[PDB]
Amino acid sequence: RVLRGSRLGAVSYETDRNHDLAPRQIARYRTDNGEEFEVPFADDAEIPGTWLC
Amino acid sequence: KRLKVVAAFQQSGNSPMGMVLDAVPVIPPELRPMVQLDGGRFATSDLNDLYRRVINRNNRLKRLIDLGAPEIIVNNEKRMLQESVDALFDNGRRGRPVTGPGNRPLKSLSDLLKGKQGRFRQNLLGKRVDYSGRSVIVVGPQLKLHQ
Amino acid sequence: GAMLDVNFFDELRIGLATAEDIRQWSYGEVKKPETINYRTLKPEKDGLFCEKIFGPTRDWECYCGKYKRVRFKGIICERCGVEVTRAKVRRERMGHIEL
Amino acid sequence: VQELFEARVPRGKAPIADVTGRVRLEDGERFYKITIVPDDGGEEVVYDKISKRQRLRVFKRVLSDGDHVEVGQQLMEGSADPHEVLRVQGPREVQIHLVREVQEVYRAQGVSIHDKHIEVIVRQMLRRVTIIDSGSTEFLPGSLIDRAEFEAENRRVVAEGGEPAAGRPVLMGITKASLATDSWLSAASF
Amino acid sequence: RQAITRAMADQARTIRIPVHMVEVINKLGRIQRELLQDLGREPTPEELAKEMDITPEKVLEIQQYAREPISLDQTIGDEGDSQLGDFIEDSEAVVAVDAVSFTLLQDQLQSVLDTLSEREAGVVRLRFGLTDGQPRTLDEIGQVYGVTRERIRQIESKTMSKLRHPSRSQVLRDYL
Amino acid sequence: NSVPGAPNRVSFAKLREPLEVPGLLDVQTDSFEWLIGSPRWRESAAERGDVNPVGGLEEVLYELSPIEDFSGSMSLSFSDPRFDDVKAPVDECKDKDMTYAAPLFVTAEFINNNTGEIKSQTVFMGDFPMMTEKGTFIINGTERVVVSQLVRSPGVYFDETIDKSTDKTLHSVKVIPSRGAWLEFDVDKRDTVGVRIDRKRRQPVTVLLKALGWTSEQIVERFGFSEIMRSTLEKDNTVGTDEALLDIYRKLRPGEPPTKESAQTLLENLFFKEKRYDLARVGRYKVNKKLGLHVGEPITSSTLTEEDVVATIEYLVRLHEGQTTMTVPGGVEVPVETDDIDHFGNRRLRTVGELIQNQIRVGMSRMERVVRERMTTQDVEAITPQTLINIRPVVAAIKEFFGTSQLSQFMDQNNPLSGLTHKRRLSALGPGGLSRERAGLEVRDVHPSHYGRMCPIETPEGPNIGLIGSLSVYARVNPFGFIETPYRKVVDGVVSDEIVYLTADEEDRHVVAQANSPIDADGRFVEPRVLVRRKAGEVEYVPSSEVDYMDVSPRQMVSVATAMIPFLEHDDANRALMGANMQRQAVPLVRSEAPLVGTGMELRAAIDAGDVVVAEESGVIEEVSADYITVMHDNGTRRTYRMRKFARSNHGTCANQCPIVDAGDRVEAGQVIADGPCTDDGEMALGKNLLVAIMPWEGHNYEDAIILSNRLVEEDVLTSIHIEEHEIDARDTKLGAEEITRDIPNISDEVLADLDERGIVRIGAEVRDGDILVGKVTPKGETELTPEERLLRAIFGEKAREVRDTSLKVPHGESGKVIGIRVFSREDEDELPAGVNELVRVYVAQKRKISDGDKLAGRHGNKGVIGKILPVEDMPFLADGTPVDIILNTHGVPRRMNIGQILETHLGWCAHSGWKVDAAKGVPDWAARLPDELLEAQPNAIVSTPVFDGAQEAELQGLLSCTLPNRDGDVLVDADGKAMLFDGRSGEPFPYPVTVGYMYIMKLHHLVDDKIHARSTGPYSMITQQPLGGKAQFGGQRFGEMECWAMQAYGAAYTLQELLTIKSDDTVGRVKVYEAIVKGENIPEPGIPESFKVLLKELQSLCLNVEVLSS
């Protein structure tokens, strides 16, 4: 009778905390036509050289 | 009748450059979901075919331009690209609509608004509500008027 | 302008959108006619469902699975490239096609 | 009812006069040629195609040749189009005619509707005016804008640019007046 | 013909399927058509696996892969106002009673852990990550309290024995 | 009478009708055995001429044969279709969900022209579903019934449409064929014709005439008497026959350079080649009847002819001129008149054989196209008809017809009248017919040709009035598809017995008498001035010598279900429509008592409905049981009839079958041997007989509500079985496979005591709403764990239990015992869809009582729900202690014009108590025409007043005055039909006598349990975020548009904001609302709905910069 569907994505339930998070850096990437973009990477993480903007 | 649209473009802070188009946006995938049912019978959302046709013809045109071809092939490919974007924005406007399996026309991006099945006509038709119920009715000849 | 929309409104101004505003709303250029993997049922890279462009399918999880906690929030994985956030941002993030 | 609220032209369109005077009633071959002799010195307005299936309007007796009729007197029997009674008898008399004609329908079934429920709808018809002279203030002929907006700028533009626009009351139906609104979001749903 | 067949293998399907799977799917379809015209009925999958020199579970996997998706923009019911996508229960949604049950469970857990001492609640919260979402180990708990890992383990076992009481734990038993 | 085991139902009829009712399912069975080509149909068509009879299959294969290539060097034939037996019998197919099919076998033949061969095989054409003995097909287990269909007959038509700007009657003609190209010969606003060959653009007839091969001289000597054709001759404006072909090609085909060779071959390929233009045999016969061309030759050559085209144009121009007749050169004269589409002379009936034939033809066209393709690509001296033939589009066309079509519907069975009326049902919708929105208002009305061919009463009363009808009783379908009707022929005023079946046209040719005419018992009328029906549907008083046809009987113009209403001639047409429509929604009760007063149609309509086991041959009963009857025939052989006990119908009702014969009895052929669902002793029984008063009682029976006694609840008088069917399937997934077992995670062992060791419940266990029916557990996979769930598992030591429970639970508001369990398994090698290993079906049944809210109705449209069930003490009892059963209301009787229920009530009281008139001084005057053996009757005796010839007022009143008492000498009901009631509640008598009697009421299929429906919070939708809709789910009510108008008109803005934000779409708001109600706080402020943000994302996606501004 009834037909059910499911997108392939897990749904959690937690509290959106704003105070205590894992800290993180910011790096600037530069494209060919003078565009700049800032990507927040994690702290304990390697900073890759090139990055698709 | 021409000064109408000429003063319309002059009076506002618009520009006539945006009637030709150079980048096409993509609606988010939760509004066009590919959900599976019970048993793996997948259910797409009928805009992904239009987006796939636009992506395919654009990639083929890029390959043809990088390759270098005579003018007939490039003009045919650009005409097909233009008709793909036209079918994406409004199917069935220019000539025969792009159809799917069983001669059924695909619900394009503008068909979510107009018609009896659009967003506007539904949103004026009303939603369905929680905390409701129905049943058959019978006469209540002992109740008071506010009961 | 207002992108958070906390219930105070005065005007709803329509207007004709340009190429700059179109490529300024977008979060990445979709460049492949692929939707989902046929075997593992996961979204492809640079496709019409790509988790780098539109966001994560699962709540607070990157694509490669390195970060899975709410403590990592607002950051982008170094390998897969998915910003860790809620799975309702796939409702709202838009992409663009470069003709 | 629907042809009255839409302000369409009717089927049995009996004509109306434009000025007083005795009539030049003439019953031609298979269709009548009704001309009106004006009371004062004026032109004789001729009505061309009045078929014999239409009937003479009975009033005060049957219609006769040389009947001294009034200004907006209905000529034959039937129903006058309200566009013509507006241009002839102004804005007050068309409101009297539009209410009384609708209220004649509902009385046939003994249905009681108070007139203020109809006077709200008739108020929404005559809100706009036509433009025949643009003046010197951002206007175009053939435009239909609000009466409250046409006069309010004409209160100010008579100083420093005193070319006032020429306005006239128009009667438009419900289906037409509902589209010309100030909100695009409401008119999108129509 | 090579380029046309390659493009038909690439772009003629909604979800993308590689070239060798397209080839074996078309082989399976041609062999099923031939056996349908010959036998007169639909072939058994074991007979198809016998014909194609593979296993019947591989035949079932290929038949699973061959299923094209259906569209969401048709009319299911008699009236065309009912589209297909208006009869799909979103099974990955929020049930809206488990959420308030989770909040009530968090509040009861906070009260129950407050019925213990300060050090016991501290070591349990830092053991199970109840306050930040990071499960620390006995080394980190003995570092933040200045004692051995074994003393922390003893305190943890003592508290786990303390919580395993009916009087202390019936209100938590009813949550599962 | 004429049925051996019949109950003695004494009739009130005066007319002795000659003709009995025909076979009620012949409209299905004759058409299907015409399509097969059965030998029974062969001799039946040999009974009336037809020296060359052909089935539908051989007709299709003969109009296909032969197939030829572009060169004509190879040819394929088709001949001799023959069938096998059916592969599996009826009950086994209905059990295992297989269709009821049989194989086709066709001898194909391939002939090589160049070197000389035949190649004769026996090509298996495909499986083919077969009609059962009740006119029903079986598709995948269910029972489907193909509905017939009315279409417009192909041929010529004529009409005029006057324009008031022209004041001229502008004629027209549409020669509409089957499967062809349209063409018209209009007349324009001027005095010129317009020839719109297939609908490009208008043209004059001189272009097509010179294109046909005609000169102006032949134009003049054929068309010689109209200024219209002379003015078009002077306005021909294009000189040249080849120029006319060039102009025709240039006008018909756009964007193509014209040529003089292919244009002349195009026109012969468009209208005179019998492969792309085929008006049918019916259409050719209709055209030859209309123009009088072919008068005595058999109907062949299904393409057009130029003689027919020029005769059409001559007929059109002489109708435009205005005549009374015209003879064609070489043919008989014909009257000139226009044509009516709604007439049944132009509206044939595409029955089930025609529909199956059209589907087979449209399959064989694609199969022929594949053959014509692979005729060339294959190599010669290697191929054969086994290699050339692909049967899969034919079998796909058949399987695509029987499922997923408009005309193939489920058999509406909840009582055997409903099956009988779902067959013999005539519609105008469906493929090949007009749409509902495009339905003209004139095609919904009753044409005067419907007398005896279609019921003007029985039709659906929604937005489908007149589009769907049913056949009449004595009607019959021609071989051509027109509808015949019997008539008694009468010569010189003496009414004979020669019954002649007329159609609509030759009905119009003659004049037609009346059924109830006073005949002198010698053949002749008693008055010269008789009622009669003229040609155009008029009603006159003709002298009694022009009459040449009489009706056979009354009730000829009525359907089957409408012929079961007593005193139909006293009811209005709307309420008789409602009564005949509600007579088939009745449910089968558990006792099924026969009605007291009825018509004579119950017995035939029951034993023709097929739901009654009839004795096939005369013999003696050997052994009865509750499950089978074995009879012993006159010569040795025995046969056993397996009953159906508690079988589920298509709508949940029950289908019991109990015997009515004893051990030692002797039966005859055709005698009823076993009752059905709604039968008693042979005849139909849809309800019970109940005492009824017509007083208004305390406002409980206010505005058509009904109150009942408690005796009907106590004594199971209105109770019925209902059987529901649940289903679950253990598929296979990526992570593993779902398993059916008992080990359900996190579920107590208290509710796991019902089901057996393998998961399913046991037979006999009573289930409540929400119990476990089939234990099913799925693999789920791995997820992260929240710290609180981790700590609770660490405290309690319960394991992970990685598998997820998705069991089968009984839905909300259901209960009852468990009858049967049917399980299909992969290891037992049954057919299943791909990836499913175990299918298990559980049948739950419950015994629904009567309750307030349930809907009851009589046989006259007097419906109404049950308002209150009073106890048996406070119910207005009669003069001797008998309490009444139901209490109707007075005010609903006179303003609906259905006092047929009052006459039924009076005659029901007379038939219950029993009467005996006094023949001491002879028969009284009112009972002179009253037939014999009705002068006295026992109590509880059945009677039958037929439809239009039944009881009269004087007969009923005099019979009601003499109505012999019960036990003591107490005539409880006086001469007016009333009685002195007592108030059971206060105690005093009611001060005025009240009408009482015995009515017949039925319980309808609108029970409360299928309607009561509620929702607090349940399943939500996927694309939009609104709550889901439908009683099958939890489901929320639609707060529509006019309700928003009402909430705006009240001024209540806050309730409207709540109803459109936090009850439908505010996804972050619904959880906060539920939390605030549970914790007991104030409801928070609503946010932006989801629909508006979806609209915003679409408008941004459509290259429109939509921006929200604040200041």
Ligand SMILES: C/C(=C\[C@H](C)CCCCC(=O)O)[C@@H]1O[C@@H]2C=C[C@@H]1OC(=O)\C=C/C=C\C=C\[C@H]1O[C@@H]3C[C@H]1O[C@@H](/C=C/C[C@H]1O[C@H](C[C@H](O)[C@H]1C)[C@@H](O)[C@@H](O)/C=C/CC/C=C/C2)[C@@H]3C
């Ligand atoms: C609207 C319609 C059929 C409706 C579904 C039912 C009749 C509506 C009239 C009414 O309200 O009484 C038209 O039906 C045909 C073609 C076009 C239309 O179909 C349509 O456009 C609509 C549906 C067409 C085919 C549906 C096939 C399957 O859908 C399910 C299973 C299959 O059939 C459906 C069941 C049909 C039997 C019905 O029968 C009716 C009562 C119930 O409504 C049903 C039990 C009875 O009135 C029955 O005696 C009369 C049937 C009408 C005979 C066929 C006429 C033409 C059931 C819902």
Ligand SMILES: [Zn+2]
């Ligand atoms: Zn990742």
